Ligand binder design. Structure first.
Ligand SMILES: Cc1cc2c(cc1-n1nnc3cc(C(=O)O)ccc31)C(C)(C)CCC2(C)C
Ligand SMILES: Cc1cc2c(cc1-n1nnc3cc(C(=O)O)ccc31)C(C)(C)CCC2(C)C
Ligand SMILES: [Ca+2]
Ligand SMILES: [Ca+2]
Lengths: 210, 9, 210, 9
């Protein structure tokens, strides 16, 4: 069973600009583990599989969170550390193109449909329960948990937003964009790590290891 | 995966 | 209006191993244009936008098609030219990792749920009507067409597969994998083009231009 | 985009 109430509870329980951004990401990696432990049945998976799912999904999970946090920011994002990054500052740091993709494909679309925190939490739990993650000991159990999440999300959307029958599908169809932006984010991060000119803290650095 | 394991325990 | 019957009609109307694969892709790019013209309302978009959508989406559109074509192939894919590529041959050509992703994340999952041709066509039309494609003259009209497709797909799934209420969401949740595999496919292709050791025919080559 | 334009006409 997968009650949307517990998923919202997990969201609520955890509530060089590139250097600022990396610091915020490292801070939120610790909070991400706490969030994941509060998603129903995650902690019951084998420890190896919990590791695989969080290593595979952390960037999409954090991008979804800070994008939704930024709905009331004009042309920018709100970092977990309290700072804004405006698109002009992002451009000035050499990461303008991917930053604009976050604003246009995620933040503005979350703002336009007024995605709420239960929906964000369900989308993140779907991302977390990624049965394609390589090396999982039981992919079928992860797919089953994913199916429980989106069954609960759909019932929630249909009840709270009955005038928007397409809202459930509209939520899920942000996940390809999230995947693409996440992959590009990872490529930038591996390049920052290679160049050596950008401080990367211990947990973010660990996520960038083999 | 050292930090991640420790935090999951 | 967006009848699933016309979408299935479009599918039906068009029905070095790396060198073989590139030849098949170039062949199918011509057929892709014909398919797109048969999707309701695509031809009514501005010509500039039709170009943008096909250039943005061609790789995901072709990957979805050959993956579904390969459901009855053991550990391999069936090319549009009639040839098989087995995973051992793909590995022997230096592209084993992405080939295995196609088999595991797309072909086997299409086979396991017995995705049918109406569902494949609807998923492809959703991919085609990508309102995030940069430079579109009217993104809202493309999103509206996307919404008509997945509204029609959901009604079709619920009617034909009433015992599988999650089937609609399960279809849409193959699109992140398709996006990731498509991006990796493009990276390989740009590298083949750079190295110069792989024949690339005129339409595939044009898709690889700026 | 030469081939693509020609085929879309
Ligand atoms: C880590 C990270 C890097 C980047 C970006 C975002 C991040 N991440 N990743 N996780 C994050 C988490 C937060 C946060 O919660 O505040 C902020 C930024 C984050 C964007 C897309 C904003 C710009 C491009 C680069 C590569 C600088
Ligand atoms: C063009 C292309 C390249 C590759 C692959 C696939 C393709 N494409 N792209 N469009 C295609 C269309 C067909 C087809 O319809 O037969 C076959 C292969 C195709 C895979 C993923 C099978 C292996 C990796 C490389 C980069 C060789
Ligand atoms: Ca890459
Ligand atoms: Ca790249």
């Amino acid at each position: 069973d997968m009650p949307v109430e517990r998923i919202l509870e997990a969201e609520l329980a955890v509530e060089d600009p590139v250097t600022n951004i990396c610091q915020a990401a490292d801070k939120q990696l610790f909070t991400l583990v706490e969030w994941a432990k509060r998603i129903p049945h995650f902690s019951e998976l084998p420890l190896d599989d919990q590791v695989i799912l969080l290593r595979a999904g952390w960037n999409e999970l954090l991008i979804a969170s800070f994008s939704h946090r930024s709905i009331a920011v004009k042309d920018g994002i709100l970092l977990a550390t309290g700072l804004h990054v405006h698109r002009n500052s992002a451009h000035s740091a050499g990461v303008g193109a991917i930053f604009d993709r976050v604003l246009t494909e995620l933040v503005s679309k979350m703002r336009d449909m007024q995605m709420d925190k239960t929906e964000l939490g369900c989308l993140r739990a779907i991302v977390l329960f990624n049965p394609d993650s390589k090396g999982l000991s039981n992919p079928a159990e992860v797919e089953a948990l994913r199916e429980k999440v989106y069954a609960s999300l759909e019932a929630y959307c249909k009840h709270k937003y009955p005038e928007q029958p397409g809202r459930f599908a509209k939520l899920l169809l942000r996940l390809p964009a999230l995947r693409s932006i996440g992959l590009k984010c990872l490529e930038h991060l591996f390049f920052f790590k290679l160049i050596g000119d950008t401080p990367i803290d211990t947990f973010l650095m660990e996520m960038l290891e083999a | 995966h050292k930090i991640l394991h420790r935090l999951l325990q």
